[PDB]
Amino acid sequence: ARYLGPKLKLSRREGTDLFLKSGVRAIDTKCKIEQAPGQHGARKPRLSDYGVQLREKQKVRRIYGVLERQFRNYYKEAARLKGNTGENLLALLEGRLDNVVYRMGFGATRAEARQLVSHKAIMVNGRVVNIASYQVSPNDVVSIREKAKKQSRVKAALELAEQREKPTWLEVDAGKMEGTFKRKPERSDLSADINEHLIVELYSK
Amino acid sequence: NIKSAKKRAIQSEKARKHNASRRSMMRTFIKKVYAAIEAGDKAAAQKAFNEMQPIVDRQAAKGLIHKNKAARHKANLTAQINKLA
Amino acid sequence: KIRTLQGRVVSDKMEKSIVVAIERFVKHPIYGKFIKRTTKLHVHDENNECGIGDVVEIRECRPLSKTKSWTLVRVVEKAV
Amino acid sequence: MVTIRLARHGAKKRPFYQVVVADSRNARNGRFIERVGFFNPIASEKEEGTRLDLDRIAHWVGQGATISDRVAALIKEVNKAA
RNA sequence: AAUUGAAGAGUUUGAUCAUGGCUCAGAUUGAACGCUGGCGGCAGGCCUAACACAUGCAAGUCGAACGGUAACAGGAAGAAGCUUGCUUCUUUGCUGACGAGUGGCGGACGGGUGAGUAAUGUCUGGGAAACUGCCUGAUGGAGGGGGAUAACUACUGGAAACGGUAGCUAAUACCGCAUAACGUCGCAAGACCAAAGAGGGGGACCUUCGGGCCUCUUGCCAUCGGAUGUGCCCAGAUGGGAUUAGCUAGUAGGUGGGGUAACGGCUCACCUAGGCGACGAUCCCUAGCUGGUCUGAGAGGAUGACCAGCCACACUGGAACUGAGACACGGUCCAGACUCCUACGGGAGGCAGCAGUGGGGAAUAUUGCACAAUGGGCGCAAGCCUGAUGCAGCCAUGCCGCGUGUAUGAAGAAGGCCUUCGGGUUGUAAAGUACUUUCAGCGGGGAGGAAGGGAGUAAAGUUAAUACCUUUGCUCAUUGACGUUACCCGCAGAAGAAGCACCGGCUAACUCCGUGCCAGCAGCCGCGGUAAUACGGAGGGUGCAAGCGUUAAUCGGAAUUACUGGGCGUAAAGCGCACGCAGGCGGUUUGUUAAGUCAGAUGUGAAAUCCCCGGGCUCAACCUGGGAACUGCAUCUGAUACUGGCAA
Ligand SMILES: [Mg+2]
Ligand SMILES: [Mg+2]
Ligand SMILES: [Mg+2]
Ligand SMILES: [Mg+2]
Ligand SMILES: [Mg+2]
Ligand SMILES: [Mg+2]
Ligand SMILES: [Mg+2]
Ligand SMILES: [Mg+2]
Ligand SMILES: [Mg+2]
Ligand SMILES: [Mg+2]
Ligand SMILES: [Mg+2]
Ligand SMILES: [Mg+2]
Ligand SMILES: [Mg+2]
Ligand SMILES: [Mg+2]
Ligand SMILES: [Mg+2]
Ligand SMILES: [Mg+2]
Ligand SMILES: [Mg+2]
Ligand SMILES: [Mg+2]
Ligand SMILES: [Mg+2]
Ligand SMILES: [Mg+2]
Ligand SMILES: [Mg+2]
Ligand SMILES: [Mg+2]
Ligand SMILES: [Mg+2]
Ligand SMILES: [Mg+2]
Ligand SMILES: [Mg+2]
Ligand SMILES: [Mg+2]
Ligand SMILES: [Mg+2]
Ligand SMILES: [Mg+2]
Ligand SMILES: [Mg+2]
Ligand SMILES: [Mg+2]
Ligand SMILES: [Mg+2]
Ligand SMILES: [Mg+2]
C-alpha cells in the first residue's frame, strides 16, 4: 500500500520539494536535491510530451502518498463530478482526511499526519476515523483524541504548521487540538506549481 | 422409490381402477344411445339418453369427467335424435 | 370496430379459403431506405364473393381453420 | 393463494427487505406482482426504515391476499394512522 | 440535476506522398500459468465430459379425518416393592403421546442444467373460444342408508426384494338414495346432478353417564363471482449458407360426426384442388430467448456466468396414470444402455439437488453449521420438515479499504557500483537518536440482526353466559447458527508483514563487465562477428505494488465492411459487349386517398441494472429511498407538404 522507501529520492527526480521530510529544516540542501536522482541523475532528460505528462501526475501522486489504483479512481471520480475534471481531481485529493490532518498542522509530514489517522488518534465530528482516505467535507470537525493529545510529535507539528503559509478553508485551534473544514478549497488556494490539465491529458487518451 | 409417498404410487392405482370402471360404464351407456340413433329407433334413443343423462351429470359432479364434458354429450345426442327421430 | 386491415385478394380460387395480400412500407432498420414488406393472410369469406384482385377489408377473429383467424368485413372495387 | 411477504435484498449481515405481493409459490426473491413497501431492520434510530403503502396492501388483502407473520407485525407497529 | 461527448504511435522508401496490411498505447475477464504473497469487507468459483457416480443429506406433515397400541411416559380398580408414602409389575390405550397402517394436504413448489429447439421458443404488441388447488365476495345446502378394506389375527412361500390363503374392522376411503337452482341439456314443456364430519367450552332438564342439548370454531356440497395461475390464436421481430430453388396427401380449404377445459385438420369421412416459396420456401449448418453484460463519443461490435423473467430437459427412447395442476428431477409402466446386491432361484438403482468421488482439463472449493432470520410444505395450535435459505470453510479470482511503520538523523560511515582517480552514486538510505502501535498476537468488556411465540391477567367481539374461541393491551420468564460477532478497553514491542516487470525506438528509466551471427533476445521495427544502454550478470534507474508479469479472450483505436463513415483510369476493384424479365427509381397539373410520413392523446415498455440527488455500513467497495431513462411497441384522433394508391 504505502510507498515506504526513501522519501527525498522522490523530490529529487520530480524536481521540486514535496515536503516528505516536511519536518524541521527548509529549502532542502541537507539532501542534494536536483543534480543526481541516480547514477546518471545529472544528465538532462530532453524528455517527451509523454514524459512531462507522466511526471506531473507522478509529482501530485508522490505528494499525497497515493498509489496508482486510488489515484486513477480519483480521476475517474473528478471526471464524473460536474465542472472541470482537473480541478475536482485536486478537490477530492484535498478532502482526504490524512491530508486535512497534516494541513491543520497536527502532523509534520503528510505521512506522519497519516500514521496519526491509522492509529485511531483522530476524530471527525466526534467519532474515530482510522482510515487515511476518509473524505472530509464542509463543516466537518477533526480533532486529536485526548488519549495521546499534546504528545511529542503533534506539538512540534502544530508548531511549524504556522511556519507554513497556513490554509484558509479551515480553522485550527491548537488548544482543543480541533479544526473545522470550512469550505472545499477553491482552485486558487494551493498549487501554482502543479499543472492539472497535464495529468488530465495523461488519463484522457 | 424409497420415499414415503411410495404410498402415493399405490394410492394413485386405487383411484386408477376406480375411475377405469365407471369411466367405462359411463361410455357404455353413452354408446347405447348412439346405437339406437344409428339404427333409426327414436324411442330407444330417448330411452338411452334418459338413462345416460343422469350418469353423465353424475360422474361430472364427482369429477372424473368435469362439467362441460357432460354438456356436449347431452347436446350432440339431443341434436342427433330429433334430426329424423 | 377493433382494428382492421385491407389489401388486395391474390387468390379466390378455393372454397372460402380466400387469401389476402397486405403490402406495407418500412424503414430498413440499418440503411434507412423504405422497402415493401408484404403479409399474406388466410381469411374466411362465406358464400365466396371477393374476387382475385378485389381490395377488401379484414378483421381478426378466433381460429376458424388451422391457418384462419381472420374474416372479411366488406369489399372494395372489382374488375381490377 | 397470493401473499404479502418479505423478499430479502439485503447484503451479508446487513439485511434489507423488499416487502412484496406475489404468487405464494414463487421464490422468496423472485417473481412478484408489485412492491408495496420495504423494511430496513437495521434502519436505526436516525430516520426512515419501514415505509409501507398501506393503501395497496389492505386492498390486496381485501382483494384476497394474505400476510406474513412478520409483515402484519410491521403493521401493528407502524400503528396505521399516526 | 439525470448518456452535456470523440487524440494517436511503430513499420514498405535513400528519401517522399499516397495506397495497405501487420503492430502498440485503452478498457474488459467466471480466467490459467511463472514469480511472489500480510490483514480485512463485498462478491465470484467445472467455461471442459447433458461424462460416470460410492456414501450422508435435498419432502414431508396432520392423533383436532380413522381402527388404533409397539416404543417411553405417566398414571389405575387392583396385585404390592415395602425403608407406611419415597414406591415395584401384572396389567389396563385410561391419556401425554406415537412405530406401522387407512385417510387429507403437499411430493407439478422451492432447487439443478441448457441437451433439444431458428419456432408447440423468446421478445413487442394484441386477440377469443377456456380451465383454474389452496385464499377470498355472495347465496343455499348440509338428509337418510349400504356394501367394503389396510392395519390386524391364523396358517404360509422366499437369501432378499417382496409375497399367498383365509378370516376380521374405523373413518373426512368408497357407493346408492333422497333433496335439485340463480347449475347442466332443452326454443319450451320438461329432464337430469352433491355432500362429511372433527374439535373447544358449557345452564337448568334428563339420558343406556358414552352423550343428548346449548354454544361458537373449523372442515364438506352446490352455483355465480373475484384474485392468482395456466391453455389457446394473431401480427412483427428474433442467427448463417443458393457450392440448397422449388416444397407440400391431412397437405390447403369446405361440409358432417367425433373429440378437448376450450377455438381449431385436433381427429375422421366425404367434397373442393388447394397451401407454401426468390420479401428466401424446402434442405443443410449452428443456437435456448430476454432483461441485460462488456466495449464504443455515438452508430455500432461482441456477448447471454453470477441476479430476475420466459422456455426446455431430469440416464436414453417411448407412454400414459393420478391429480386443480405432470405426461411428473429424488412417481408408475415398456424398451434400451449401464451399474449394484444374490444363498443363484431372483431382486434393485440414476447427483444436470447439497457436499463428495473417478474421469476429462491450463483450471474451478467443505462429504461443515443452523432453521436464529426471510421464505415454502403440513398442522387450530404449539410444532415438524426445508443442502430453499441464512451462515461458516477453501482459492489474491476479482473489486474496495488498510497495513508492512513516523519523525529525526552527514561531510554523507562501511560495502557495492561508476570514475577521466579529483571525485560521483546508492543516500536520509543504513546505523544512531527520539516517537507512534492501526493490523496480526494476548487479555477484558460488549450492540444489532428478535419479530414472535409461552404462561398468565385485563378489556372488548360473541353466546345462557362472566366458558370457549378471536381480537387488542398488561405484566412476567423466554428464544442467535453466524460467534473467540461487529464495535469498545487494556497489554507488549517497530516488534509478525515486499515482491514482480521493465529501462534500444514505439515507451517512463544507463552504465560497466561477460559473450562475440555463439549463447541468446524479440508485441512491431529489429538486437548478437571485440567498446552490446537490445544477449547474460551486476550497480543504478523507471513503472507497479500484495500483487507483478506471461498466455488466452471481446471491443477499442480500425474511416481496416465506410448506415452514421470509404472506395474502383495508373495502387485491391467496372461483367468483353449488348437486349431485357423481376426488382429499384421515375418529368409535369388537378382532384381524391391517407398506407408511408408528421402531430397529439392513451396504454404499455417487470423488477434489478445504467445514470442524477440523496440516505446507511469508520471510508470505500457494498447496501438503500426517490427520480430520471427505458431512444420501443400498440390503439384512437387528427394534420396532407413529401412518398405510395386511385382518377383524369
Ligand atoms: Mg489494493
Ligand atoms: Mg360438434
Ligand atoms: Mg531503411
Ligand atoms: Mg505460490
Ligand atoms: Mg403416527
Ligand atoms: Mg369423499
Ligand atoms: Mg340424485
Ligand atoms: Mg353420507
Ligand atoms: Mg366440425
Ligand atoms: Mg445447443
Ligand atoms: Mg470510434
Ligand atoms: Mg446458482
Ligand atoms: Mg421421458
Ligand atoms: Mg385427468
Ligand atoms: Mg437425482
Ligand atoms: Mg452436486
Ligand atoms: Mg488431470
Ligand atoms: Mg445453496
Ligand atoms: Mg565509498
Ligand atoms: Mg488484533
Ligand atoms: Mg439481539
Ligand atoms: Mg430491538
Ligand atoms: Mg525514454
Ligand atoms: Mg527482456
Ligand atoms: Mg562489451
Ligand atoms: Mg468500425
Ligand atoms: Mg479505402
Ligand atoms: Mg488494377
Ligand atoms: Mg467495360
Ligand atoms: Mg425497469
Ligand atoms: Mg457515506
Ligand atoms: Mg400524390
Rg of chain D over Cα atoms, rounded to whole angstroms, equals 12
As a whole number of angstroms, the distance between CA B58 and CA B72 comes to: 14
Of A80, A56, A63, A141, the C-alpha closest to A106 is A141
Taking the CB of residue A58, how many other CB atoms lie within 10 A of it? 17
* Torsion angle defined by CA atoms of residues C36, C40, C45 and C48, in that order, rounded to the nearest 10 degrees: 80
Domain ranges, ordered by start, for chain A: 7-93+190-203, 94-181
Element (DSSP H or E) covering residue A170: strand A170-171
Angle of helix A68-80 versus helix A49-64 axis, rounded to 10 = 100
CA distances for A177 relative to A150, A159, D37, D39, D62, angstroms: 8, 12, 46, 42, 63
The set of long-range contacts for A146-154, using a CB threshold of 8 Å and a minimum separation of 24, is A147/A121, A148/A121, A149/A177, A150/A177, A153/A107, A153/A108, A153/A112, A153/A116, A154/A106, A154/A107, A154/A116
Taking the CB of residue B78, how many other CB atoms lie within 10 A of it? 13
The set of long-range contacts for A151-158, using a CB threshold of 8 Å and a minimum separation of 24, is A153/A107, A153/A108, A153/A112, A153/A116, A154/A106, A154/A107, A154/A116, A156/A23, A156/A108, A157/A105, A157/A106, A157/A107, A157/A108, A157/A112, A157/A113, A158/A105, A158/A106
Of D64, D59, D62, the C-alpha closest to D36 is D59
User: How is residue D39 annotated by DSSP?
Assistant: B
Cα angle A29, A33, A35 (rounded to 5 degrees) comes to 125
**Is the Cβ–Cβ distance between D16 and D42 less than 8 Å?**
yes
Residue C38 exposed, middle or buried by CB count within 10 Å (0-12, 13-18, 19+): exposed
As a whole number of angstroms, the distance between CA A98 and CA A91 comes to: 14
Domain A94-181 classified CATH 3.30.465.10?
Answer: no
As a whole number of angstroms, the distance between CA B43 and CA D47 comes to: 84
**Is the Cβ–Cβ distance between A94 and A136 less than 8 Å?**
no
Residue C75's SS3 state is strand
Query: What number of H helices and E strands is found in chain A?
Result: 8, 3
SS3 of chain D: helix, strand, coil, percent, to 5: 20, 25, 55
The set of long-range contacts for A21-27, using a CB threshold of 8 Å and a minimum separation of 24, is A21/A109, A22/A102, A22/A108, A22/A109, A22/A110, A22/A112, A23/A108, A23/A109, A23/A156, A23/A160, A24/A160, A26/A163
Rg of chain B over Cα atoms, rounded to whole angstroms, equals 17
Q: Where are the alpha helices (DSSP H) in chain B?
A: 6-39, 42-62, 68-81
Q: Are strands A141-143 and A178-181 parallel, antiparallel or unpaired?
A: antiparallel
Of A201, A203, A204, A188, the C-alpha closest to A90 is A188
User: How is residue A165 annotated by DSSP?
Assistant: -
Q: What are phi and psi of B48, to 5 degrees?
A: -60, -45
As a whole number of angstroms, the distance between CA A118 and CA A130 comes to: 5
Of C23, C48, C49, the C-alpha closest to C36 is C23
Residue A144's SS3 state is coil
Question: Which distant-in-sequence residues (6+ apart) come within 8 Å of D6 by Cβ?
Answer: D17, D18, D19, D20, D39, D68, D70, D71
**Is the Cβ–Cβ distance between A141 and A178 less than 8 Å?**
yes
Taking the CB of residue B68, how many other CB atoms lie within 10 A of it? 10
Of A49, A66, A58, A50, the C-alpha closest to A15 is A58
As its CATH architecture, domain A7-93+190-203 has Orthogonal Bundle (1.10)
Q: What are phi and psi of A35, to 5 degrees?
A: -70, 25
As a whole number of angstroms, the distance between CA C48 and CA C15 comes to: 7
Rounded CA–C1' distance between C22 and E305, in angstroms: 44
Superfamily name with CATH number, domain B1-85 = Ribosomal protein S20 (1.20.58.110)
Q: Is the CB of A35 under 7 A from strand E?
A: yes
As a whole number of angstroms, the distance between CA A61 and CA A13 comes to: 13
Neighbour order of strands in the sheet with A170-171: A141-143, A178-181, A170-171
Q: Which three cell numbers stand for residue A99?
A: 491530508
Query: What number of H helices and E strands is found in chain C?
Result: 0, 7
Taking the CB of residue B25, how many other CB atoms lie within 10 A of it? 12
Of A69, A68, A49, A48, the C-alpha closest to A58 is A68
DSSP string, A19-30: -SS-SS--S--S
Q: Is the CB of A28 under 7 A from strand E?
A: no
As a whole number of angstroms, the distance between CA A169 and CA A67 comes to: 26
D20 bridge partner residues: D5, D35
Q: Which three cell numbers stand for residue D64?
A: 384476497
Domain ranges, ordered by start, for chain B: 1-85
DSSP string, A62-97: HHHT--HHHHHHHHHHHHHSSS-HHHHHHHHHHSBH
Backbone CA torsion sign across A136, A140, A146, A149: positive
Query: CB-hemisphere CA count at 13 Å for A23?
Result: 11
As a whole number of angstroms, the distance between CA A157 and CA C27 comes to: 73
Taking the CB of residue A79, how many other CB atoms lie within 10 A of it? 15
Contacting residues 11-30/B vs strand E (CB within 7 A): 11-16, 18-20, 23, 30
Of A168, A144, A169, A146, the C-alpha closest to A158 is A144
Q: What are phi and psi of D5, to 5 degrees?
A: -150, 170
Q: Is the CB of B32 under 7 A from strand E?
A: no
D37 bridge partner residues: D52
A196: Cα separation from own chain's centroid: 15
User: How is residue D6 annotated by DSSP?
Assistant: E
Taking the CB of residue A74, how many other CB atoms lie within 10 A of it? 24
Experimental approach was X-ray
Query: Where would I find the beta strands (DSSP E) of chain D?
Result: 2-8, 17-23, 34-35, 66-67
- Which chain E positions come under 7 Å from a protein C-beta? 1, 7, 25, 27, 38, 41-43, 59-61, 101-107, 109-111, 126-136, 173-176, 180, 183-186, 191-195, 221-223, 226-229, 232-237, 252-255, 257-266, 271-277, 279, 307-310, 321-324, 328, 330-332, 348-350, 373-377, 388-392, 400-410, 412, 416-418, 424-429, 434-438, 448-453, 472-473, 482, 488-490, 494, 498, 506-511, 539-546, 563, 583-585, 595-597, 606-607, 611-613, 615-620, 622-626, 634-636
User: How is residue A108 annotated by DSSP?
Assistant: S
**Is the Cβ–Cβ distance between A84 and A102 less than 8 Å?**
no
Resolution value, angstrom units = 2.8
